Write a protein that binds this ligand. Structure first.
Ligand code: CL
Ligand code: CL
Ligand code: CL
Ligand code: MG
Ligand code: MG
Ligand code: MG
Lengths: 195, 196, 243, 204, 125, 241, 226, 244, 250
């Protein structure tokens, strides 16, 4: 499937997601943003079966936006991840399960801490310093295991992420047409427009 | 399984072997395959033990509830209730049923309900795995208006042969005699019928 | 008071007034009778000719159930039809499961339980008909009459409608004068006379006589309508007796 | 493909003298890929401890379900659930999904607060209870754990001796399973104190 | 299910249950709306019969339906919550399907539709 | 005053619809009696055929529920047959589910539970009938269990129902006060029927012909009703001593 | 699994082995396969262990309610009818194979039932992987008019055949004796001919053998006062 | 048909009032008084059991104060049976929220849901409303210590101090007189008991006629503790405050 | 057909009274007296077997019923309403507890379930309340011995001792004078028989009185031996002879 990486540094979470959308023979698009803002300080990247990915992401987004209005309050990243896990855990024993894997990068404004949650289509949740889905981990985790330090700056996090993407572009057979990078911190969500 | 019902002067006689098999293993060698639904209406069961026992229980219940309201059911009525269950559920059932009963107006009657869930009224019927070996014998030897003794000998000799050749059949030959006098149970042991 | 405003409500007497009011609709209706003969039953009904514009012999009132049961009723004709429609469903399901055509006593209870069910709730209205029915089964001839309450019994003779008192008196004479029994052909003649005698309570308008019969010897135990020569013979016998 | 051996991991529970021990590895994986070295498989509802192996999504779901149920139990009963009762709840809960079951190997451990009797129990994925006096094993290295526990175990071990036995049983069993290891935790449970120890083991 | 027709016409062509619902509104605390050239203001009366009230947590009279639309009311407080909840769900449903937040007119038309439905449905006031 | 129309409590804590259903019970103007022998249970009921047009063979308030259980009804025939059909369905279903014949007292309880529901649920009216269930139970022996529109039931040594139940009850009471036993110490059911008829004659102060009575007899493994000629043989034996 | 039922003069005896196996691995060396439907109606289960246990508790529960409703001690033919109608409805998807035995006011009864909903009746029955080993012993030694002490011995002899000759069976023998007009006596581990021999060595470790990273006290208590 | 016997529980009066809600409130006005007082460092729940007996087992008895979870408790005024139906629903909602979000339900979200259920019985179904008024004492990490009330109408409001049941008019005047914002739990305990003591229809206020509960951060460090007072503990606080 | 009564038949009157519950309590008041007394080592529940006719076999009518092996129930009011409640109480003990936890419910929670069924008949569509008050005596491991009263409203209260029905007011005053926290079971039975004699007019003997206890485990009444942990039911119904023996020491 498509590559979605995540790395939690000192004061922010960084989500990198491929831009390619391939339908069998042809690459239909090379600028696809595989992410949805769930709340001002929570971002979710996704990869899986065509159609199901966006349908699930927008469904979650709608539910978190509904809660935000009802209570006039932003749910903690932990609370949002738990809600998403339950929805995927419910989905696997459904008539037609969502084949969707997600990373949830959020900044908890109460604890003043960045948080990264990795949830697969089964509803398998784990909190990680850095995560991936599909084959992305196989190429990148050896580099992250070596270089990652919990007191890394955002700039150091982006540099380690560039080394991860470079290794993917070298050894992965598929052309994923680069990655859109987004940072989640105390000030909210912004996109790195040059990568 | 070897089972058969025969129409005679006095009424009707039902006969069966007593073997229940699971592959090559004889699970029970003295099983009673002749089950009463009413006082003078009996059924012989072939195919799935689970399916046949389940249906027999329901028919017994239907004839009991019938009797409470409308009095004694005809043998035809009993056969009809079986056919209804077997025909409507033919996709989920493996049951071959002979129904033998005695009215005082209709006297002795025999009905067979094969796999399909069709009904056939016959002077005599044979069913079960062993029946295939005695189609020749039964056709040559059956007469209409036999005595009780003649009919017992005909069934004893018939099931004897079917037990001899069929591995799925064996044990004792149980028989039920339905007449105006009432219900008589007969049993015949290997040492008796093997030397025929 | 207010006990008579709702169906299924017991009055301080222990009565269901709504059922007793349904009987008034029955008593308002035309006369219908039944006669149990040696080997079967005869049914007859009074049909009031409201206008010359009514097509003779077309507005048939007596109904068949299965092929061996006849049904006639007095009161609200639609309620009678609704009951016969149910009777036909009951007779159909019985024969489907048990093969044999429904016995008359068995069929009597099927109507009885259904009519009784319409006295259990305030969400339904009792039947505004008394039904006379019967036929031939394996145990011979049976005649039944079924009131709005769900009450029914077996009868030698039965009558209902506006001229029931007159009819009953005539039926009682036949029972006394014929202990050995009445023949099917005699019963048809007697049925014609009793309807003509019972028409004195409905003497304003002239009427049309309708007869049916089930007999083991005469109809092979099937329900048939008395037509042509046999009907005219019965009308002639009836007209001779009133004069 | 086999749901019970996608994520991997093991749980073992033993009885000692006036004490019980329950232990688990910390690995969560996607078949060959190691994903997490902090995935604890032992939970507790009051003084009753529940270890769950098998499909990780079901491990999390059942923990949330038994927390839910034991919290309602306490509000209504006005007392903490006991190991014997909780065992019957786990069995009931698993079997009501008879034809769509949770792919798990649960293990109950705890001391009855009134009798003071040490209690352990194991279940198959549809809730058949295994109430062994000695030890219960579960997970992708259950064969290895059976082998270790059968030789190492002796009855009436003191809490600090039982720790060594269950620790060596888990470690050496995990080191002969590809889908187990990446750290280990051991709970030593007495009537009114519970100690939790993280073991140092090879990280391959 | 309870199917009783509570909202019905009277001989003079009035639906009393709808008119008696307006009498509940008359009793409710005063709400006012004034739109300027580049703003709208919603003023709301708080009856001072209730002091020792915790104003932090007490349900406020003006509710956000979305980030751009607000709803105030007069009448039964419990009834208002059901209309606010339905409106908030429809606002997020609109964003999900039309990929655009509701217009003020559309949100009004929806809430007004819910209120109408409860004037000719069985077993509801 | 709609607390009198449906089965809800009056200010006195009474159900008037239940009380009025009890009054409907005596609408037929028929008296029934049930007694127990050593080996049998006998039930006798008055038979009144007022119309000469009726077929007297079809006029009956005694029902054969199962092979073992008999039932006599005090109340209108529609409600009687409603209760009869349900009792027959319940007895048949019981045998199918639990693999043994439904006991007399268990059927009595089941019909009583059904009657209780009609006293609590508003949409269902009570049945205006008192059901007397008789059998020779394979565990308890000769058994009389009676149900009423209130949903009440109890076992009886003997019992009477109808307009003149008190006269029959007191008569039976006085006999069992003498004998100091819970049954009629008699071998044959014939003589237990002769006792039942004799004590009804004494209590009502009326003579009976063969067509004025209706008799049901419960023995081990069957309940049956007597023909007019079987009752005549009984009446002859009473007159000859 | 080896399970047998044997009829005798004044009652019925049921026996079973004590081994539960996950394929070739032995999960419980002293399992209890003798389940109670009602005080004097005991049954033993082969097939899916969860199914046999579950199906006996459900029918056992409904039997207790039926007993209270009818004011009568429960009958074996009731348990039988309820088991077969349940199992048949599920078309063998509930893998419960049971030997049902007991005493009631009717007398002493012995039935078997298979997962699909068929039932068997006999004076001696066997069930499970070791049924052929057990049935060999029963067919060799069974006679009419057995005494209670002969029936226990025959039933026990038939289980032993299973224990020794069938790999699916092993360990001890459980027995339950249901005699007419008496309390059913459950004899847990009636025979124990498979006690593990003393090991050559003690594997008790010196204290401090295991490497530890962190210790911490776990709070199993509720939130405290003050 | 059936229409004849329908009371029509969910209709407006000509004045625009809900008959059954107004009559249910009349019922609650005869129930034992319940008081909630919110302080800076905790909440107090005090409630009066209705004319008891000497043979009532008090130590195992509960009619007034119920636990919804570890952070939220309720004081009941009205039909005890009706209350238990709603309490069991609230307990399930609190566990549903904890399962979904892996966080304890905020106090207001629980109060709104129970209040929405009550509302439903006034607008549809044709059933009688719940003859119950609740005082919710709860804590969460957003608003801290919170007091709410809900009544059969399904309307809920927040309070610093509030009463429900009998003599609320007299009770609310006494609370409004003596309550201050900088008040502490130990002071609030005294106010709650002094108010009941003056408003009670009984001759004297004793331990056997009271149910008492406190929600304190008087739990060792950064956590909250619920304390349902035992009969002997109510007797001790009555002597301490100088009422007996 | 269909049950078209989907609306409450119990509603608040202008005075705040639930008429049908009040009237149900009036039906209970007319009912025959039943009482319960809790001792240190057991509980006793008793009532009069008011035989409708002497021909009637009053043994076949059970006013005191076993709900679980350790819980018993007696009533005052409408007998039929009690009988169906006992059938529902026995079933709910299994469906909503035993089939989940593999053990019988504690007294307070079964009482809670019976209370819920009686509350619903007070609010549910097209039904009247139950015209009974129940006295439920039971034992469980963690709560010990307990006695509960359940009213038509669904309200339940725990009692040391109490009486309901005809002569409850007088009976409760009699129990207040005699009850202490040091009573043995035999002492509670003695007080139960003294209290019940006051409210009985005619015959007073073992055949006219129905009395059951929740006391020690009865291994003789278990029906099987072999399992040490299973020691038998704590509920036991006293025989006609056992009552008459204690009426000589009265
Ligand atoms: Cl009949
Ligand atoms: Cl029932
Ligand atoms: Cl097998
Ligand atoms: Mg390893
Ligand atoms: Mg590795
Ligand atoms: Mg009613």
């Amino acid at each position: 499937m498509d590559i979605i990486l995540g790395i939690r540094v000192q004061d922010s979470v960084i989500l990198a997601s491929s831009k390619a959308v391939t339908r069998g023979i042809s690459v239909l698009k090379d600028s696809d943003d595989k992410t949805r803002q769930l709340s001002p300080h929570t971002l979710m990247s996704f990869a899986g079966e065509a159609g199901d990915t966006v349908q699930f992401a927008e469904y979650i987004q709608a539910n978190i936006q509904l809660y935000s209005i009802r209570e006039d309050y932003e749910l903690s990243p932990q609370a949002v991840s738990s809600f998403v896990r339950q929805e995927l855990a419910k989905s696997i024993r459904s008539r037609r399960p969502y084949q969707v894997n997600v990373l949830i990068g959020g900044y908890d404004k109460k604890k003043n801490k960045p948080e990264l949650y990795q949830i697969d289509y089964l509803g398998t949740k784990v909190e990680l310093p850095y995560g991936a889905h599909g084959y992305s981990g196989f190429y990148t985790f050896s580099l992250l295991d070596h270089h990652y330090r919990p007191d890394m700056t955002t700039e150091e996090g982006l540099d380690l992420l560039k080394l991860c993407v470079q290794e993917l572009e070298k050894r992965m057979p598929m052309d994923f047409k680069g990655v859109i990078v987004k940072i989640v911190d105390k000030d909210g969500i912004r996109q790195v427009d040059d990568f | 399984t070897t089972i058969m019902a025969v129409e005679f002067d006095g009424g009707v006689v039902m006969g069966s072997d007593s073997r229940v098999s699971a592959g090559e293993a004889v699970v029970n060698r003295v099983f009673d395959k002749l089950s009463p639904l009413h006082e003078r209406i009996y059924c012989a069961l072939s195919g799935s033990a689970a399916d046949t026992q389940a249906i027999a229980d329901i028919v017994q219940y239907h004839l009991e509830l019938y009797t409470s309201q409308y009095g004694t059911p005809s043998t035809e009525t009993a056969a009809s209730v079986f056919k209804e269950l077997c025909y409507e559920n033919k996709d989920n059932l493996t049951a071959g049923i002979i129904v033998a009963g005695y009215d005082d107006k209709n006297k002795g009657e025999v009905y067979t309900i094969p796999l399909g869930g069709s009904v056939h009224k016959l002077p005599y019927a044979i069913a079960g795995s062993g029946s295939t070996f005695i189609y020749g014998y039964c056709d040559k030897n059956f007469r209409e208006n036999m005595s009780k003794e003649e009919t017992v000998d005909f069934i004893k000799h018939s099931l004897s042969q079917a037990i001899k050749w069929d591995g799925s059949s064996g044990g004792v030959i149980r028989m039920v005699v339905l007449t105006a006098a009432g219900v008589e149970r007969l049993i015949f042991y290997p040492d008796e019928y093997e030397q025929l | 008071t207010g006990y008579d405003l709702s169906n299924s409500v017991f009055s301080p007497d222990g009565r269901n007034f709504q059922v007793e009011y349904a009987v008034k609709a029955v008593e308002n209706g035309t006369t219908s009778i039944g006669i149990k003969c040696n080997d079967g039953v005869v049914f007859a009904v009074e049909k009031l000719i409201t206008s010359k514009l009514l097509v003779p012999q077309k507005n048939v009132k007596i109904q068949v159930v299965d092929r061996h049961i006849g049904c006639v009723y007095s009161g609200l004709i639609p309620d009678g039809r609704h009951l016969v429609n149910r009777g036909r469903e009951e007779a159909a399901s019985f024969k489907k499961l048990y093969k044999t055509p429904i016995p008359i006593p068995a069929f009597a209870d099927r109507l009885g339980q259904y009519v009784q069910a319409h006295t259990l709730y305030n969400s339904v209205r009792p039947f505004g008909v008394s039904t006379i029915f019967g036929g031939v089964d394996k145990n011979g001839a049976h005649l039944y009459m079924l009131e709005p309450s769900g009450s029914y019994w077996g009868y030698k003779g039965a009558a209902t409608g506006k001229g029931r008192q007159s009819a009953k008196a005539e039926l009682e004479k036949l029972v006394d004068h014929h202990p050995e029994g009445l023949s099917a052909r005699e019963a048809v003649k007697q049925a014609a006379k009793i309807i003509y005698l019972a028409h004195e309570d409905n003497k304003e308008k002239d009427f049309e006589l309708e007869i049916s019969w089930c007999s083991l010897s005469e109809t092979n135990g099937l329900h048939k309508f008395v037509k042509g020569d046999l009907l005219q013979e019965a009308i002639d016998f009836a007209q001779k007796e009133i004069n | 493909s086999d749901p019970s051996s996608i994520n991997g991991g093991i749980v073992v529970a033993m009885t000692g003298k006036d004490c019980v021990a329950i232990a688990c590895d910390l690995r969560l994986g996607s078949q060959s890929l190691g994903v997490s070295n902090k995935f604890e498989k032992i939970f507790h509802y009051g003084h009753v401890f529940l270890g769950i192996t098998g499909l990780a999504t079901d491990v999390t779901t059942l923990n949330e379900m038994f927390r839910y149920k034991t919290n309602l139990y306490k509000l209504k009963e006005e007392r903490a659930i006991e190991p014997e009762t909780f065992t019957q709840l786990v069995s009931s809960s698993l079997y009501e999904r008879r034809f769509g079951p949770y792919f798990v190997g649960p293990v109950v451990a705890g001391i009855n607060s009134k009798s003071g009797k040490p209690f352990i129990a194991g279940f198959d994925l549809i809730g058949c209870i295994d109430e062994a006096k000695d030890f219960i094993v579960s997970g992708t290295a259950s064969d290895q754990l059976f082998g270790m526990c059968e030789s190492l175990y002796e009855p009436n071990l003191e809490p600090e001796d039982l720790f060594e036995t269950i620790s060596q049983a888990l470690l050496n069993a995990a080191d002969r399973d590809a889908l187990s290891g990446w750290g280990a935790v051991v709970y030593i449970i007495k009537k009114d104190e519970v100690v939790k120890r993280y073991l140092k083991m090879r990280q391959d | 299910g309870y199917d009783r027709a509570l909202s019905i016409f009277s001989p003079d062509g009035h639906i009393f249950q709808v008119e008696y619902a307006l009498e509940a509104v008359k009793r409710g605390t005063c709400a006012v709306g004034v739109k300027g050239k580049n703003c709208v203001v919603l003023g709301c009366e708080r009856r001072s019969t209730l002091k020792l009230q915790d104003t932090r947590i007490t349900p406020s009279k003006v509710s956000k339906i979305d980030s751009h639309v607000v709803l105030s009311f007069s009448g039964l407080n419990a009834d208002s919550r059901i209309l606010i909840e339905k409106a908030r769900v429809e606002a997020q449903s609109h964003r999900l399907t039309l990929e655009d937040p509701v217009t003020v007119e559309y949100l009004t038309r929806y809430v007004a539709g819910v209120q109408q439905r409860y004037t000719q449905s069985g077993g509801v006031r | 005053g709609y607390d009198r129309h449906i089965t809800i409590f009056s200010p006195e804590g009474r159900l008037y619809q239940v009380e009025y259903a009890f009054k409907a019970t005596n609408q037929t103007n028929i008296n029934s009696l049930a007694v127990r022998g050593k080996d049998c249970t006998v039930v006798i009921s008055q038979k009144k055929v007022p119309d000469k047009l009726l077929d007297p063979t079809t006029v009956s308030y005694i029902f054969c529920i199962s092979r073992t259980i008999g039932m006599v009804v005090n109340g209108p025939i529609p409600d009687a047959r409603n209760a009869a059909l349900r009792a027959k369905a319940e007895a048949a279903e019981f045998r199918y589910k639990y693999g043994y014949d439904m006991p007399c007292d268990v059927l009595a309880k089941r019909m009583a539970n059904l009657s209780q529901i009609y006293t609590q649920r508003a949409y269902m009216r009570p049945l205006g009938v008192i059901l007397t269930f008789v059998s020779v139970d394979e565990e308890l022996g000769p058994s009389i269990y009676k149900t009423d529109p209130a949903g009440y039931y109890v076992g009886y040594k003997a019992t009477a129902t109808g307009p003149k139940q008190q006269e029959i009850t007191t008569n039976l009471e006085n006999h069992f006060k003498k004998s100091k036993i819970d049954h009629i110490n008699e071998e044959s059911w014939e003589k237990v029927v002769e006792f039942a008829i004799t004590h009804m004659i004494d209590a009502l102060g009326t003579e009976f012909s063969k067509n004025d009575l209706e008799v049901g007899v419960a023995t081990k493994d069957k309940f049956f009703t007597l023909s007019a000629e079987n009752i005549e043989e009984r009446l002859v034996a009473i007159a000859e001593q | 699994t080896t399970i047998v039922g044997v009829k005798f003069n004044n009652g019925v005896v049921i026996a079973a082995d004590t081994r539960s196996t996950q394929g070739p691995i032995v999960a419980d060396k002293n399992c209890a396969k003798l389940h109670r439907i009602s005080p004097k109606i005991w049954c033993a289960g082969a097939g899916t262990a969860a199914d046999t246990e579950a199906v006996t508790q459900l029918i056992g529960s409904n039997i207790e309610l039926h007993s209270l409703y009818t004011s009568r001690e429960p009958r074996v033919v009731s348990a039988l009818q309820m088991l077969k109608q349940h199992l048949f409805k599920y078309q063998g998807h509930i893998g419960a194979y049971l030997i049902v035995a007991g005493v009631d006011p009717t007398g002493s009864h012995l039935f078997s039932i298979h997962a699909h909903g068929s039932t068997d009746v006999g004076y001696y029955l066997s069930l499970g992987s070791g049924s052929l080993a057990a049935m060999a012993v029963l067919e060799s030694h069974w006679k009419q008019d057995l005494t209670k002490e002969e029936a226990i011995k025959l039933a026990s002899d038939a289980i032993q055949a299973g224990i020794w000759n069938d790999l699916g069976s092993g360990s001890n023998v459980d027995v339950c004796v249901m005699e007419i007009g008496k309390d059913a006596e459950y004899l847990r581990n009636y025979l124990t001919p498979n006690v593990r021999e003393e090991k050559q060595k003690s594997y008790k470790f010196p204290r401090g053998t295991t490497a530890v990273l962190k210790e911490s006290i776990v709070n199993i208590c509720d939130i405290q006062e003050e | 048909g059936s229409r004849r016997y329908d009371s029509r529980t969910t209709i407006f009066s000509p004045e625009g009032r809900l008959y059954q809600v107004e009559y249910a409130l009349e019922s609650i006005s005869h129930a034992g008084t319940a008081i909630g007082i919110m302080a800076s460092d905790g909440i107090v729940l005090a409630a009066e059991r209705k004319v008891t007996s000497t043979l009532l087992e008090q130590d195992t008895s509960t009619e007034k104060l119920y636990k919804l979870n570890d952070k939220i408790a309720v004081a009941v005024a009205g039909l005890t049976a009706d209350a238990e139906i709603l309490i069991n629903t609230a307990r399930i909602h609190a566990q549903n929220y904890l399962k979904t979000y892996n966080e304890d339900i905020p106090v207001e979200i629980l109060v709104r849901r129970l209040s929405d259920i009550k509302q439903g019985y006034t607008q549809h179904g044709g059933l009688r409303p719940f003859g119950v008024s609740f005082i919710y004492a709860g804590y969460d990490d957003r608003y801290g210590y919170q007091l709410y009330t809900s009544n059969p109408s399904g309307n809920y409001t927040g309070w610093k101090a509030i009463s429900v049941g009998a003599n609320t008019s007299a009770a609310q005047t006494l609370l409004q007189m003596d309550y201050k914002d900088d008040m502490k739990v130990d002071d609030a305990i005294e106010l709650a008991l002094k108010t009941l003591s003056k408003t009670t229809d009984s001759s004297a206020l004793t331990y056997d006629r009271l149910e008492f509960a406190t929600i304190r951060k008087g739990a060792n460090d950064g956590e909250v503790y619920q304390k349902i007072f035992k009969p002997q503990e109510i007797k001790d606080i009555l002597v301490k405050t100088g009422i007996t | 057909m269909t049950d078209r009564y989907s609306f409450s038949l119990t509603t608040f009157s202008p005075s705040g009274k639930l008429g049908q519950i009040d009237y149900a309590l009036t039906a209970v008041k007319q009912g025959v007296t039943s009482l319960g007394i809790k001792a240190t080592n057991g509980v006793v529940i008793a009532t009069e077997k008011k035989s409708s006719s002497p021909l009637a076999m009053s043994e076949t009518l059970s006013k005191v019923s076993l709900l679980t092996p350790d819980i018993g129930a007696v009533y005052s009011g409408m007998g039929p309403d009690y009988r169906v409640l006992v059938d529902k109480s026995r079933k709910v003990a299994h469906t909503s507890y035993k089939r989940i936890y593999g053990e019988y419910p504690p007294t307070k929670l079964l009482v809670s379930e019976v209370a819920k069924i009686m509350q619903e008949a007070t609010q549910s569509g097209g039904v009247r309340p139950f015209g009974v008050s129940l006295l439920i005596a039971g034992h469980d491991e963690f709560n010990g011995f307990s006695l509960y009263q359940v009213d038509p409203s669904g309200s339940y209260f725990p009692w040391k001792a109490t009486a309901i029905g005809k002569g409850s007011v007088a009976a409760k005053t009699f129990l207040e004078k005699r009850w202490n926290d040091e009573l043995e079971l035999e002492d509670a039975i003695h007080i139960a028989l003294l209290t019940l004699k006051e409210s009985v007019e005619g015959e007073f003997n073992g055949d006219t009185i129905e009395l059951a206890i929740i006391g020690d485990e009865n291994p003789d009444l278990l029906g099987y031996t072999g399992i040490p942990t299973d020691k038998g039911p704590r509920f036991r119904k006293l025989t006609s002879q056992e009552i008459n023996d204690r009426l000589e020491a009265l």
